[PDB]
Recover the amino acids of this structure.
């Protein structure tokens, strides 16, 4: 299901450009980006 | 705290020089401007000049520069006004003043009469109200101003209205009224006391029933 | 020269009123202005300095405001011994220190009819050959009043002296004195004399008469 | 004895300038510039109805002092023949025949300003013959007390006693024509001197030497560090007594001022030599001084300092006042004599002061200054707010239009001075409570309807500085800063809803105690003496010699290279400081809704949310029912992680402190600044110029032009003592811990910015100026300023840029 939900083609297509940049207004909070995109994965796996 | 004054009710003949004074005290006479100012009775104020503290420089009005002369006595802290009897209608009052920059003090004034000063002793008439209380006192035909009027040597002051003098036909008239309860007069003696310093005359007139 | 214009010329109020006096110039004088108080027949009392500075001894009820040429004096509470004429006076330059045209503070309270008391000539005066009838019109408001003298019902305008007192510093009323002077023979040639008061408080004059 | 004359009017008047071309309208020109216009202007003056009495008077004094003041004891003067030809064609000629008749029975000699030695026997009429033809009078501008053009008329050739004398000078150093200009002055302005003020054997090169100039460069590079440390210690040693004050007893800002006055003296005297006593007695001229002194005793002592500061100012008109001060202060032995003399001249003082509108505002102050013998300047200032306000706002406006690059600062200061309470700084009060309402309260200074929305001044400075640099956090600025009663007290609203004086209702005391706490922590902990001990300067070379190479009007230095090291050691910065700044931040426990407003209740954030609600999620598409089945639990996690008991102060501390606020020791350090940074001022072939003050002066200084200043902070350490976090109870603790991520990103940003705002190999260039001064106030660079060639006018317009003597023509 992780392959279905996360290890896709489009999800990987925008997750990398959210990793390198994005999040308007925050910008320099690139370090917290892999501080938000693990929690939702943990919730989904625990569900 | 400043008291700058001396004279009152000046009398001068036409053709003779006249000297008004104002003696100051209670401050440093070396640190302000002395001033002379003129007023016709019932009208506005007119200037004369300034001369002090020791610079001895003066500023007059152009309308009064040929007219008046200012002098200052430094030891006794006094200023003077010397215009003589050059004019006749100027028989009016004057004032001597100190610098407004600290605050505009003043003197009680100097009333001048340009005439031969035909002094006249006052004539006193009691205003008997046909026995029966309101009484009065009439002083007529005296000259010059002023005259001091009291009731029972000033002991009776409540209900007393003294009325201002008037000049007519070159003579002065003054009146006064006193109000007392109906149970005192004529049982209580009431006397009008008139003093004229120019004639130096003191007159006592008892109010008697008609 | 700088001419100071005051408005209004006359000011009639009631005690305790918050009133103002307006003094305007032709050109600005920064704060080179002063307000002086003068009551009838004595020297002035400077009230406000510099259009913004009060002075000691003066009661705090007075205040002032000043901008350019339009300067204002303010009386928060009107009381009886504040009544009098007032002068605004510039100090920009001293070729004299022009004063205004004058503004005489006055009261407006409870129009009152005069108390009229007529007095025949005294015997002491009659011994001197004269005879004066003296009329007193005390405690009336307004000051505007007319006095008419009639001898045997005929008006007489000659030999009449009229004097007036200043506005009262307790009750703000006025008092007037009239004196009709005549010769002793002329006094003894007539019987009835009267004093008539024409005042706004009554459509009919107040009449005080006595028969000789 | 006497002579024959008619017109002795003597009185005259000055003239006015022209303006021209694109020069600024402020006309303050000087000599030169108008080369041949002066003869025309003098001719125009000669074509006035006032010329003949002035010239007749000039002749009168000329024959008075020159002829018969050295005579008339034994030679009577008679003037039978005497005529001028002052014509409308501006051509004047004169013929004069004089007789000297000696009544005494002796033989004497006649004295004239020439090789005149003539013998006259007793009872003889000695003859004097003077002839001059109709010629164009020459024009030479001498100097006036305000240092203006004293144009005077010279004779080209006249026959005195039958012999022709050329370029004749009439009444030198004293003439009565009194025509002057308010915009054209005397001397070489700033630049015409630099053709002959420096050169082969000129003043500067003779009066500059290699050892002296290198000592000067060392002195300049030391005294800056010295004064920096002195300012640092002074501001803060004052705060030491400021903080430890117990509430209820107000303190004037000048109370502690005298408590450490010797440091103020040292500061200002090391700034400008001898200028310590001037402030030493300036700072004690109020009723609060332990040893009160009179402002007259103040001004009497050090005239030199008042002169220096007055000519340091930029207002040209003040120069005229400088003309009288010596004339004012000659022969005065004590301040009582000064009071007497000022009172004596008050007659001349009043009109000129009272005739100018600018000073018509000032009119009251001078009066009580001259009346009372016990004026104290601070009490004087508090006596009259209004005039000081009116002048100061004009000066502030001029400064604001001068330098716009600090547009907000020149902004903020202005709104401070609208309320009249500010000048109470020179009045007894409680300085901390006073400064709070000066900066920690909303303002409503207008009377249209109500302008309470103007808010406080510091928040205006904030929203000015951070105009758009942030977008999201501005919501938090509104939440916790722009609407914080500690920062914005919202005056007139406090006594509207409470009406009982609650403990929380009096925000004033809470903000005052917080302000005192922060001040004491910065003062006695951070700004402590021991901390300032751990900074030093170390010389490096001081060995090479600089030679002066010159070619005509040039002065170069062959090889400039000076470099000094500054060692920081352990520039320790304790904890508790940003703890105090957090104490400034509100302490209310309400954080849940504010975090929602930041992270969720935004503008674009809701835009992406609505976009994803209506459509999106590529591939899934039809799984829209559970879209509001995912954007509730993630927010639930972001909301449950935060503790309701904790506050935004704790949230900021977590990303700043690491360990929790409850376990913070102020004794430990937060910022560590250690190492040593160097300054390497250097160059080759740099020109030396004279450097000046603002107004006319005798003494001068100098400067070296365009130094290649390089400053490098390589090999310095700037760290955090607590690099690794310690928070046992973070605000957003849990599996969704973000506090440590905030700490890490803060550390990375700090490292990057210190790689940028800290050491970055700074390079700069300026013109090092030094005004070298001897021990006894006898600096080596000066001029006589008595001859009409040594006058330098710093404010004169550059004549090489274009000026003509005509109205826009």
């Amino acid at each position: 299901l992780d392959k279905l939900l996360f290890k896709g083609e489009s999800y990987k297509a925008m997750k990398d450009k959210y990793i390198k940049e994005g999040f308007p207004g925050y910008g320099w909070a690139k370090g917290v980006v892999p501080g938000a995109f693990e929690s939702i994965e943990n919730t989904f796996k625990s569900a | 705290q400043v008291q700058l004054q001396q004279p009152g009710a000046e009398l001068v003949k036409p053709g003779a020089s006249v000297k008004l004074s104002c003696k100051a005290s209670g401050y440093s006479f070396i640190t302000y401007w002395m001033r002379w100012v003129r007023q016709r009775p019932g009208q506005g104020l007119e200037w004369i000049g300034q001369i002090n503290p020791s610079n001895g420089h003066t500023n007059y009005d152009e309308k009064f520069k040929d007219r008046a002369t200012l002098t200052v006595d430094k030891s006794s802290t006094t200023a003077y006004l010397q215009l003589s009897s050059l004019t006749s209608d100027d028989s009016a009052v004057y004032f001597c003043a100190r610098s407004w920059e600290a605050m505009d003090y003043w003197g009680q004034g100097t009333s001048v009469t340009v005439s031969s000063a035909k002094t006249t002793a006052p004539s006193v008439y009691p205003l008997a109200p046909v026995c029966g209380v309101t009484l009065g006192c009439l002083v007529k035909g005296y000259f010059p101003e002023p005259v001091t009027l009291t009731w029972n040597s000033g002991s009776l002051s409540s209900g007393v209205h003294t009325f201002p003098a008037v000049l007519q036909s070159d003579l002065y008239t003054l009146s006064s009224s006193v109000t007392v309860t109906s149970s005192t007069w004529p049982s209580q003696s009431i006397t009008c006391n008139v003093a004229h310093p120019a004639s130096s005359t003191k007159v006592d007139k008892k109010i008697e029933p008609r | 020269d700088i001419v100071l214009t005051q408005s209004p010329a006359t000011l009639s109020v009631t005690p305790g009123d918050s009133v103002s006096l307006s003094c305007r110039a032709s050109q600005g004088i920064s704060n080179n202005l002063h307000w002086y108080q003068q009551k009838s027949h004595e020297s002035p009392r400077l009230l406000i300095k510099y259009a913004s500075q009060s002075f000691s001894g003066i009661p705090s009820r007075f205040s002032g405001s000043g901008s350019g040429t339009v300067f204002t004096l303010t009386i928060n509470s009107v009381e009886t011994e504040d009544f009098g004429v007032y002068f605004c006076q510039q100090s920009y330059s001293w070729p004299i220190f022009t004063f205004g045209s004058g503004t005489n503070l006055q009261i407006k309270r409870a129009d009152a009819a005069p108390t009229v008391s007529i007095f025949p000539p005294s015997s002491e005066q009659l011994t001197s050959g004269g005879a004066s009838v003296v009329c007193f019109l005390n405690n009336f408001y307004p000051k505007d009043i007319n006095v008419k003298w009639k001898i045997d019902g005929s008006e007489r305008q000659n030999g009449v002296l009229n004097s007036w007192t200043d506005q009262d510093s307790k009750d703000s009323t006025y008092s007037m004195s009239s004196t009709l002077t005549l010769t002793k023979d002329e006094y003894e040639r007539h019987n009835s004399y009267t004093c008539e008061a024409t005042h706004k408080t009554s459509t009919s004059p107040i009449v005080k008469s006595f028969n000789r």
User: Anything to note?
Assistant: Chain D touches chain A at residues 471-472, 602, 604, 618-619, 633-634, 637, 735-738, 741-742, 744-745, 748-749 (CB under 8 Å). The first strand of chain D starts at residue 76 and ends at 84.
